[PDB]
Design a protein around this ligand. Structure first.
Ligand code: ACP
Ligand code: U1C
Length: 206
């Protein structure tokens, strides 16, 4: 198994896109924090996988640096991937960031750190068919960018996951991957494109 994604080396990120790169990472983390509470997890300072405690379920500004850069790099690689495919990212609607409210969840979503997930309310954002094929294609690539970095840290396949060896049952080709995870990647990058549009960006191939 060889996870080779679209080559992101012959690509640079213009400084005017660094703004979305920062906000895109925030929203992607907000969506993660919500889904994690939605499935048995809570806040903690000493991670114990059996107790469902997590230190990363905090606001984007309070994250540790090791996990933080990974969220900014993956966000930067996502933008660069669109550029490597021949698509452009450009601001057109200047009032969209002001007309971008955030989702507010029930009271039970607040934990012992003062953090309560508040992703952007992007439910009223519609995508054209061409942008759907992009999100589906971007999703398969996000699996490869994740799998390549893990592989060089020694991560291979293993029936049981493990935070102390390089084992993970999802280190497999996108075809041999459970459709739940495949759909999860598509949903994540569907909001990624909606995050751009929510800030006033038009995605358009050259
Ligand atoms: N599938 C995904 N899509 C977008 N961001 C993800 C992600 N998985 C993890 N992240 C980001 O990674 C950061 C936390 O890193 P961590 O190592 O704790 O992942 P994790 O605990 O979710 C492993 P798993 O999801 O398999 O149980 C989180 O703040 C989150 O934003
Ligand atoms: O088990 C798994 C896990 N995984 N992806 C995990 C990685 C970890 C960090 C992120 C990440 C993605 C996108 C952005 N972004 O664009 O901002 C920011 C961070 O995904 C996968 O494919 N199968």
């Amino acid at each position: 198994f060889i996870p080779c994604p679209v080559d992101t080396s012959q690509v640079i990120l213009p400084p005017h896109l660094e703004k979305i790169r920062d906000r895109l990472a925030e929203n992607i983390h907000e969506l993660w924090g919500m889904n994690k509470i939605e499935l048995g997890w809570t806040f903690g300072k000493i991670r114990d996988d059996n107790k469902r405690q997590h230190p990363c379920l905090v606001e984007f500004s309070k994250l540790p640096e090791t996990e933080k850069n990974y969220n900014l790099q993956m966000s930067t690689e996502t933008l660069k991937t669109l550029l490597a495919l021949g698509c452009h990212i450009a601001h057109v609607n200047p009032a969209a960031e002001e007309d971008l409210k955030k989702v507010k969840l029930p009271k039970n979503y607040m934990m012992s750190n003062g953090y309560k997930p508040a992703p952007l309310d992007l439910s009223d954002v519609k995508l054209l068919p061409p942008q759907e094929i992009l999100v589906d294609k971007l999703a398969e690539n996000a699996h490869n960018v994740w799998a390549k970095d893990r592989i060089k840290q020694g991560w291979t396949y293993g029936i049981q996951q493990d935070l102390k060896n390089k084992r993970n049952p999802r280190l497999v080709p996108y075809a041999l991957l459970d459709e739940r995870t495949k759909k999860s990647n598509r949903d994540s990058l569907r909001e990624a494109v909606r995050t751009f549009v929510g800030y006033g960006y038009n995605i358009e191939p050259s």
